[PDB]
C-alpha cells in the first residue's frame, strides 16, 4: 500500500520478508531427518479431490542427482526457486565436473531469495520455506532456508502447518546415533501424529539420499508399505 | 519511475485536461476567421507598460510560408510546440519536397499534444492552438485542444469570453466574405469583449501570397 | 498533491511556478537592466541572497556577484537561489558554446534567452524535476549593432525590454524606469547617460544611498562589444555626479 | 505536506528539506578554516566522539586534500562528504588529463557546487547532507577559502566555521585580524577558542579529538598535518591560559 | 509503474493481487474438461445476445498447436494474449526440439508465465484460469488446470470459472474413469448445465483426439439437451 | 517518494476489476452514439455528431467514422484524441500486414492487433488506458462482411448489428426488433437512420447531426462511401416517406 | 515521525534519516561479537546464534583474505553480499598486482558501497554492521555502519547485550597492548562471556597477526581456552 | 597508434650500491630525421619510482600521464609512508595496461622500464611529500631495489639490469660481461658511459647527449645532462 518493498520497520526488520514469513506457515507438513547413513525427507500430500492425478503434485523434488528438497508456502514460488537451483547445480557440475556441496546450493538458493532488495530481477520476497537434504563429500546433511535469506543446518527439521508439533516430536525422539531404518520410522511416526488421516500409501511421499550411492531415490508403494508395517 | 499523472475520474473524466482547458479559458482571447479567398488569425493583449518590446512578445507566429499559428494559454508551452511544429513541417518538406499540408501538421501536433495526456510523469499542455493556412486543397483553420482533439473551423475563438465572441461571430460570419470584411469582423469581435477602448497596440492580426503578419499602421488603418 | 507537482490545480494554475517566483522574490536582491541607443547596462546590488546562512564579516565581499559572463560579448544578471542561478549560468554557457560550434558564429541575446526558456519549460512540464528558482536578465549587441536586453522568469517567459527590474518592487520600479526613460527622451555620451540612468534607477528603487563598493555595474556597447564590469572608482564617480545637480 | 520532498517549493517559496539538512549539519562536528599571514590553517573538532573511548587515537580525520595543495574538509555525514571528495579528486584528475595543469580552486569549487546542487532537483535522489570547505594558499595569491553549502551556494571567506557551536567560534575568531598573524601563533588561539567554545572538549581530549592541517611557507605550500611536537606546546599553553 | 512491485505481501502473508485475479476468474464463464482413455472432452459456457451478436467470433475452446487445446475462464483479453504467447512457445519448442510440444511442457510454461507476472515489477497478474488438454511424449492424454497464482495440477476431470465447486462435486460423484465418447460428452454437458442455463446456445463442446480437435455439431447438443430436460422431470 | 503520486492504474480492485478500465467505459457511455449493422450488400456505420457550434466546417469533416484501409473502416465512441492515436496505429498495422504478406489484412487480425495494444496498457506499466471503443467494420474474402466491437480492456466481440455510446441500449432494442439477416443497402440505411432517431430522442432525424458511411464489395473490389449532407437529406426524406 | 520514516531519502525536521537509523537498529538484534588487539595480533570472538535444539549454530566469522577476516551483526544476506564484494576486491588486487590490498582502501570501498544505497529511493541501506580484523603492517580493527561511515578501534564490540562487553573493554583496554596472544584470547573470551555459558559449538573465535594468517581456533584449543576461562 | 613516427631510442637501468642509475639520450627521431634533440625520456613517478621508455613518444607521454594521476590519487589516500605504491606495483599496473591493449589490438608502441626502491625503511622522504618543489647516500640492498621491463606484447619481468631498444644487443652484452653487485656511483657511471659510447657509434638513432637519473635514499635526482666524454 504505502510502504515500499525495501522499507525497514522501526525494529530494523523489512516489512515484506516479515509478511512473507506468514506464507511459509501455510501448506502441507514435511519433515527431514539426517543420520550418518543418509538423509530422509517425508511429506504429507493433502489431496483435495479424488479427480486429481496424485503424482501430478510433487511435494518432494530433486534439485540434483544427490540433492532432494521439500517445499512449503507458495508452491509456484517454490517451483521457481527449485528450477533455479537445478539450473545452477547443473552449471556447477559442468564448470567443475563434480557434485555441488549442499551448502553452496542452499546459499545460491537463498541468494535468489531477497533478490528484490536490489542491493547490487524479482519484485518481492518468495514466501517459500525449503528443507534441502543431500549427500556431499562431507556426508549427508539437511539445511533449512526461508524468505529472510537465513540458512540453517539441521539434524532434523520440519516445515508446514504442523511445524510446531512436528519439531516437538522430533526434539523428543531424535538421537544423533540412530540408524536409517529408525530414521524412517521416526519420520513416519511424526507425520502420523501430526496428520489427520490413517497414513496409507498415496497419502505420504518419501525420498532419501544415502551414503552408498549418493543418488536421489523416490520411494514407491512397496517401501511405504514396508515402513508402515514396521511402525509400532 | 514513469506513471500517468492524468487519470480517469470515477465519472470517466480526465480532470487534468479539464484544468488545462480552465487555464485556456482564463488566458487572453484569440480567434480565427476563414474567408472565401483567405484566412486570418487575430489576438489581443493588455496594453504594453511603456518598457516591454512589443515585437518580442508576438503570439501570432509563422510556421511555414503559407502556415501560421496563434495560441491561448501558457507561453512556454507555445514556444515548445511552435518549435516542434516547425521541425515537423521541415521534416515533411525533406521527405516530399513540398510544403506541409495544413491537415497533416494539425494531425501530427494533435498527436503530440495527446501524448502528454497519457505518457508518464508529465502534465497536459496548458494551451489551445489555432493553426491557419493554405494549400492545394484550399484554406484551412484548425483548432487543437489540450486533450489533443482537433476541429476544422470556419471561424472560432479559443480564450476569455469565447462563448460571447463565438456568438458574435455566429451572428456576423458568412460563408462568402472578403479578407477585409473578415479583418473588420475580427477587430470588432476583439474590441467587443475588451474592457475599455482597443487600440492598435492591443491587436495582432496575421493573414494568409505567403503568411503575412500585419504592421501596426495597417491595424490602425483598419481601426478607422 | 496538485500544488506539490507542476500539474494543474482546479483553477488552471501551476502553483509551483508561483512558489518558485516567490522564492526568487524572497532573496531581496534588486537588479536593473537599461538599454541605450548603442549600449546596454545591468546593475545589481552585490549582496548575498537571503537564505539560511547570513552574511559573515569574514566573507570576501568582492566575491559576491549576481552578474556573470555567458560569452565574451553576452552577459547576464541572475537573481534567485544561488545554486539554481549558478546552474543556469552554466546551462547558458553550454548553450552558447554549442551554438558557436554548430553554427560557426556567436549566438545573440534573444536566441540564448529562447534556448534557456526551452530548457526551463521542461522543468515546468515534467513532474520529476524541480523548477529553478532563478530570474535572469541578459544583455548583448546583435549583428545589426543595436543593443539587446531580454528577461526571463522561472515560468519560462522571455521578453525584450527597453528597461526592466528583477526585485521585490514591481509596478513602482516600473514607474521609476518609465519616468527616467521619458525624461531621457555621441557614443560616449550614450554610455555615460545609460550608466547614470541605471545607477539612479537602482538608487530610487532601493530608496537608500548606494555605496560604490556594494553595487556591480556591467555594460555592452558598440564601442566595446565585450561585456565588461566597470571599476568601483568609476561607479563612485557616477554616484558623485548624482546629487551634484 | 510541502516538506516531504526536496523537489517541491512550499507556499512561501522555501525548500524545507534543504533547511532540515542545514539543521543536520549545524548539529554535527565542528570544522573551521582560517587564513593567516603565511598560510591557511584548517582544524576539525570531533566533539561527538567524546563518548567513544575505544576509538583508535587520531584515526578519525575529516581533513582531506586534493592535488597535495588544496585542503578539503566538511561538516556533516562522512559518507556523503567522501562522495563529494571523490568527485573533487575525479574533477582534478580529468582537468589534468585534459590540460596538463592542476585545476584552479574556483573552477573546482564551482564544479563541486553544481554536483551538490544537482541532487536537490529530483524527487528520487537524497540531497547531500554536508557543508564542504575547500581552501588553498599560494605565495603570490595568499589564501583562498571557499565554503559550499548544501543548497549549492559557494562563498569566499578569509575565515569560516561550520558545524556545532559555529557562532561562538566565529565570534572568537573575529576578535582580531589573522592576515598579519602566522599559523604557528594561530594554533594557540585556535586551541583557546576550542576550550572556551565547545563544552565537551577539555584538556584531556584536545590531543586526540582535534585534527589539524595547514598549507603555509613551512610546508612548501603543500598539505601537511601538524606534528605532535608543534601541537603539544600550543595546547599546553592554551590550557595554562585557560 | 514501469517496474513498481504491484503484487506484494499483505500483513497476513497473502498476495492480494493474486486473490483479486482469482475473483476475476470466479466471474468468468464456466469451463469443464474430462479425461478418458485416449481422448478428452472440453465444454465451455458461452453467452451471446440473440439475433445481434455473431456467435462464431468468441472462441473459448482454442487449438494451441497440433495436439494441445485450451479452455479458460476469466478476462478474455488476458486470455487472448497469454494464449498467443503459448502458441508462440509451442512453435518455438517444435523448432528447437523437432518434436511437438508435450502437454505437460505447455502447462508448465503457462504456469511459469502466470507466476512470472505475479513476481515482476510493473506488470499486473493474469486474471484467468486455464484447462489445457493434450498428449504427453508417450501418447498418454492429460488435462492440466492452472490458476492465476501459477500453481498447476493434472486432473482426471475438472471445472473452472463461476460456480466451479458445484460442478466439481458433481464430477466427483459421476466421473467413472474410462468412458465411451457419447457418455463422456453427456457427462460434460450435464456437469456444465448444473450451473449453466439448459439450452444448446449456452454451451460449446469439443472432443480432443490424437488426430485433431473436433467441435460437436449443434444437433447432437440439442438432442442431449432434450435428454437432460427429460431426466430432470 | 513519487509512489504517493502514483495512482496504480494497472492494479486490480477487490472484485477483480480494473477501476481505470471501468471509468474509461463510463467515459465511452457518455459519448454520442455510434451504430453498426451488416446488410446483404455490405456494412453500415452511423453516428450522431456532437454539436459544438454552427461555425464548424461541415463540408468534408467526419469526426466519428474513419477509414483504416480500403477494406476496413471504423466508428469511434469516447475520447477523440486517443481514437486518432489508435486509428493511426491501425492504419500502420494494415499496411504492415500488406508489406509482410502482399495481401490485405483480414479484419479480425487488425481487430486483434489494436485490441492487443489496448490490453497492454491495462496490464503493463502505469499509464491510463485508452478511453475509446471502436465499431470496426470491413470485408475480406475468407469471412465476408464483418463488424467487431472493441473496448478499453482489449476485449472484443463480433456482431451483426450493435450500438455503442449514449443511449446504446435503446438502439440495440430497436436493432433486434427491426434488423434481419437478408437486408438490402437501402433498408439498412433506413434502419440506421431510424436507430439514430430513436436513440437521439427525435421524431424526425436531422441530416446536420448524422454521419453515415458504408462499405460494399462489387466486382471483387471494396468501395467505401461517406454520405454527404445532400445524400443524407435524400435518405432522410425517403425515411419520412415510409 | 511517521511522515518522515516512509522513504529513505527524506530528512525529518530534526535532520534525521529514519530508514538508515532503522537499518542501524537491525544491527543490535544480532548476536554479540567482540574484537581486541595487542601490538602483534587481532583476536575476534563471537556468539553463534542457535535457533532451536536440533539446529546447528549460525556461522559468525568469515575469512576475507589470508590476513583479513570479518564478523557481522544484522541481516545475514546483506553481510553475505558485502563478504563476496570484499573477497572479490581482495582477490582482484592480488590478481592485478602481486601484493595484498591496503586495508584502509578496502574499508573505504565497503563504506562507499554502503553509502551508495542511501542516496536513491529505489534502494535501502545495508542492515548489517561489519567488524573487520586484519594485519597490514600492524593489527587493525575497523567498523562499518549502514550510513556509509566507518571507524577504526583499539577494541570493538556490538550486537545484542554488547554493552557489558563494552564495559569490560573500557575497564581492561590498557592491558591489551602488552598482552601476549594467550592472554589476549582469554580477554576477548571473557569480554564475550560478559555479554551472556560459552561452548565449542556456540563460540566463534579467530586470530590474525604478524606471521599468522587468519585462522579459526580449533575445537580442542577452544575447549582448553573455555576451560581456562571458567 | 598504427605505428611509430617520433621515436625514442634505448634506455639503460642498473642497480648499484646506493640505488638505481637509469640513463637515456635526449633525442627523439622522426624516422631518419633527428628533429628533436633535447627531449626528456625518463619520467619521475614518485620519490622512489621512475619510468623510462623506448619507442613512440606519444604513447609514452600518455602512459606518463596515467602514472602521474595514479601517483596523485595514491598521495590523496596516503596516511603513512608504507601506503605509497612501490615500483613493482607500478610495473604490474603498466604490464596490465599493455596486456589489455594487446588484447584489443591497440598496443602502445613502447618498451618501458619501471625502476626504483621497493623499501620504505631507508628514508622518510614519503612522510612529507612535495610534488611542486624539490647527508651521504645510504647503502641499499639489491633485494630492496627493483628494475622491471615491459614490451608491446606485455611480456614483463625484472632483473638487476635492464636495457631497451638497441641497448639489448650492444649495452646488454657488456653489462652481462662486466656487471657486478654493489658497484659505486663512479663504476656504474663508467659502465653506463661505455655502453652509451658504443650505442652512439653503432645506433644511428642515438645521441651523445645523455640524461642520467638516480633513485637513491634522497629520492629521484635528475643529473645535469652532458655530452659523452671523449
GROMACS .gro file of C-alpha atoms in nm, chain H residues 3-176:
model
  174
 1651UNK     CA    1   5.285   0.270  -3.577
 1652UNK     CA    2   5.580   0.478  -3.457
 1653UNK     CA    3   5.651   0.822  -3.605
 1654UNK     CA    4   5.850   1.007  -3.334
 1655UNK     CA    5   6.074   0.752  -3.162
 1656UNK     CA    6   6.294   0.746  -2.857
 1657UNK     CA    7   6.597   0.518  -2.861
 1658UNK     CA    8   6.748   0.291  -2.592
 1659UNK     CA    9   6.727   0.322  -2.213
 1660UNK     CA   10   6.969   0.152  -1.970
 1661UNK     CA   11   6.892   0.096  -1.600
 1662UNK     CA   12   7.118  -0.075  -1.344
 1663UNK     CA   13   7.135  -0.139  -0.971
 1664UNK     CA   14   7.433  -0.007  -0.776
 1665UNK     CA   15   7.517   0.021  -0.408
 1666UNK     CA   16   7.320   0.341  -0.337
 1667UNK     CA   17   7.023   0.259  -0.564
 1668UNK     CA   18   6.915   0.278  -0.929
 1669UNK     CA   19   7.101   0.455  -1.210
 1670UNK     CA   20   6.896   0.497  -1.530
 1671UNK     CA   21   7.026   0.661  -1.847
 1672UNK     CA   22   6.888   0.769  -2.182
 1673UNK     CA   23   6.995   1.009  -2.455
 1674UNK     CA   24   6.771   1.312  -2.504
 1675UNK     CA   25   6.693   1.252  -2.873
 1676UNK     CA   26   6.360   1.181  -3.043
 1677UNK     CA   27   6.385   1.099  -3.413
 1678UNK     CA   28   6.119   1.147  -3.682
 1679UNK     CA   29   6.228   0.850  -3.887
 1680UNK     CA   30   6.578   0.929  -4.011
 1681UNK     CA   31   6.523   1.297  -3.916
 1682UNK     CA   32   6.677   1.397  -3.581
 1683UNK     CA   33   6.405   1.655  -3.532
 1684UNK     CA   34   6.414   1.683  -3.150
 1685UNK     CA   35   6.744   1.664  -2.961
 1686UNK     CA   36   6.655   1.788  -2.608
 1687UNK     CA   37   6.367   1.552  -2.520
 1688UNK     CA   38   6.316   1.402  -2.173
 1689UNK     CA   39   6.263   1.023  -2.180
 1690UNK     CA   40   6.299   0.939  -1.807
 1691UNK     CA   41   5.991   1.037  -1.605
 1692UNK     CA   42   5.957   1.060  -1.228
 1693UNK     CA   43   5.658   0.861  -1.098
 1694UNK     CA   44   5.725   0.920  -0.729
 1695UNK     CA   45   6.017   0.980  -0.490
 1696UNK     CA   46   6.117   0.610  -0.517
 1697UNK     CA   47   5.996   0.528  -0.871
 1698UNK     CA   48   6.096   0.643  -1.221
 1699UNK     CA   49   5.986   0.535  -1.569
 1700UNK     CA   50   6.186   0.528  -1.893
 1701UNK     CA   51   6.070   0.447  -2.248
 1702UNK     CA   52   6.197   0.345  -2.587
 1703UNK     CA   53   5.973   0.376  -2.893
 1704UNK     CA   54   5.684   0.608  -2.975
 1705UNK     CA   55   5.679   0.932  -2.779
 1706UNK     CA   56   5.302   0.991  -2.785
 1707UNK     CA   57   5.222   0.653  -2.627
 1708UNK     CA   58   5.493   0.710  -2.366
 1709UNK     CA   59   5.351   1.054  -2.280
 1710UNK     CA   60   5.004   0.901  -2.244
 1711UNK     CA   61   5.146   0.637  -2.008
 1712UNK     CA   62   5.332   0.909  -1.816
 1713UNK     CA   63   5.005   1.099  -1.765
 1714UNK     CA   64   4.838   0.779  -1.642
 1715UNK     CA   65   5.115   0.714  -1.390
 1716UNK     CA   66   5.112   1.080  -1.282
 1717UNK     CA   67   4.744   1.065  -1.189
 1718UNK     CA   68   4.795   0.724  -1.028
 1719UNK     CA   69   5.062   0.876  -0.804
 1720UNK     CA   70   4.841   1.176  -0.720
 1721UNK     CA   71   4.548   0.950  -0.626
 1722UNK     CA   72   4.789   0.740  -0.420
 1723UNK     CA   73   4.902   1.054  -0.236
 1724UNK     CA   74   4.542   1.158  -0.172
 1725UNK     CA   75   4.469   0.831   0.012
 1726UNK     CA   76   4.803   0.817   0.197
 1727UNK     CA   77   4.829   0.826   0.577
 1728UNK     CA   78   5.176   0.672   0.633
 1729UNK     CA   79   5.483   0.622   0.417
 1730UNK     CA   80   5.412   0.249   0.375
 1731UNK     CA   81   5.094   0.330   0.179
 1732UNK     CA   82   5.296   0.470  -0.113
 1733UNK     CA   83   5.293   0.245  -0.418
 1734UNK     CA   84   5.618   0.061  -0.488
 1735UNK     CA   85   5.799   0.027  -0.822
 1736UNK     CA   86   5.675  -0.332  -0.856
 1737UNK     CA   87   5.317  -0.210  -0.810
 1738UNK     CA   88   5.365   0.034  -1.098
 1739UNK     CA   89   5.536  -0.239  -1.302
 1740UNK     CA   90   5.233  -0.464  -1.255
 1741UNK     CA   91   4.999  -0.178  -1.346
 1742UNK     CA   92   5.193  -0.098  -1.665
 1743UNK     CA   93   5.209  -0.468  -1.756
 1744UNK     CA   94   4.831  -0.495  -1.715
 1745UNK     CA   95   4.775  -0.184  -1.930
 1746UNK     CA   96   4.995  -0.328  -2.205
 1747UNK     CA   97   4.827  -0.669  -2.176
 1748UNK     CA   98   4.474  -0.530  -2.211
 1749UNK     CA   99   4.576  -0.309  -2.503
 1750UNK     CA  100   4.743  -0.611  -2.667
 1751UNK     CA  101   4.415  -0.798  -2.627
 1752UNK     CA  102   4.239  -0.507  -2.803
 1753UNK     CA  103   4.500  -0.500  -3.087
 1754UNK     CA  104   4.568  -0.137  -2.985
 1755UNK     CA  105   4.921  -0.155  -2.845
 1756UNK     CA  106   5.142   0.118  -2.706
 1757UNK     CA  107   5.448   0.108  -2.934
 1758UNK     CA  108   5.688   0.117  -2.639
 1759UNK     CA  109   5.932  -0.078  -2.430
 1760UNK     CA  110   5.908   0.052  -2.073
 1761UNK     CA  111   6.148   0.038  -1.779
 1762UNK     CA  112   5.997   0.089  -1.431
 1763UNK     CA  113   6.273   0.125  -1.172
 1764UNK     CA  114   6.311   0.236  -0.814
 1765UNK     CA  115   6.336   0.138  -0.448
 1766UNK     CA  116   6.085  -0.109  -0.302
 1767UNK     CA  117   6.163  -0.048   0.066
 1768UNK     CA  118   6.048   0.242   0.285
 1769UNK     CA  119   6.298   0.153   0.562
 1770UNK     CA  120   6.583   0.373   0.427
 1771UNK     CA  121   6.443   0.728   0.448
 1772UNK     CA  122   6.147   0.946   0.549
 1773UNK     CA  123   6.101   1.120   0.214
 1774UNK     CA  124   5.741   0.994   0.186
 1775UNK     CA  125   5.625   1.124   0.527
 1776UNK     CA  126   5.604   1.477   0.380
 1777UNK     CA  127   5.585   1.464   0.001
 1778UNK     CA  128   5.643   1.770  -0.218
 1779UNK     CA  129   5.535   1.743  -0.581
 1780UNK     CA  130   5.597   2.103  -0.694
 1781UNK     CA  131   5.930   2.173  -0.515
 1782UNK     CA  132   6.250   1.969  -0.496
 1783UNK     CA  133   7.388   1.359   0.423
 1784UNK     CA  134   7.563   1.079   0.235
 1785UNK     CA  135   7.384   0.818   0.026
 1786UNK     CA  136   7.280   0.510   0.222
 1787UNK     CA  137   7.385   0.166   0.101
 1788UNK     CA  138   7.073  -0.023  -0.010
 1789UNK     CA  139   7.049  -0.400  -0.053
 1790UNK     CA  140   6.974  -0.511  -0.409
 1791UNK     CA  141   6.672  -0.709  -0.286
 1792UNK     CA  142   6.512  -0.375  -0.191
 1793UNK     CA  143   6.587  -0.230  -0.538
 1794UNK     CA  144   6.361  -0.301  -0.835
 1795UNK     CA  145   6.407  -0.275  -1.211
 1796UNK     CA  146   6.135  -0.410  -1.439
 1797UNK     CA  147   6.086  -0.440  -1.814
 1798UNK     CA  148   5.765  -0.439  -2.021
 1799UNK     CA  149   5.727  -0.474  -2.402
 1800UNK     CA  150   5.447  -0.425  -2.655
 1801UNK     CA  151   5.306  -0.776  -2.602
 1802UNK     CA  152   5.304  -0.726  -2.223
 1803UNK     CA  153   5.600  -0.960  -2.166
 1804UNK     CA  154   5.712  -0.838  -1.825
 1805UNK     CA  155   5.999  -0.930  -1.596
 1806UNK     CA  156   6.265  -0.791  -1.362
 1807UNK     CA  157   6.643  -0.815  -1.327
 1808UNK     CA  158   6.944  -0.641  -1.174
 1809UNK     CA  159   6.989  -0.450  -1.502
 1810UNK     CA  160   6.754  -0.376  -1.792
 1811UNK     CA  161   6.809  -0.248  -2.146
 1812UNK     CA  162   6.566  -0.139  -2.419
 1813UNK     CA  163   6.599  -0.099  -2.793
 1814UNK     CA  164   6.947  -0.124  -2.942
 1815UNK     CA  165   7.094  -0.145  -2.590
 1816UNK     CA  166   6.953  -0.501  -2.576
 1817UNK     CA  167   7.245  -0.603  -2.804
 1818UNK     CA  168   7.526  -0.351  -2.752
 1819UNK     CA  169   7.488  -0.239  -2.390
 1820UNK     CA  170   7.349  -0.569  -2.263
 1821UNK     CA  171   7.648  -0.773  -2.383
 1822UNK     CA  172   7.888  -0.551  -2.188
 1823UNK     CA  173   7.651  -0.550  -1.890
 1824UNK     CA  174   7.627  -0.930  -1.877
   0.00000   0.00000   0.00000
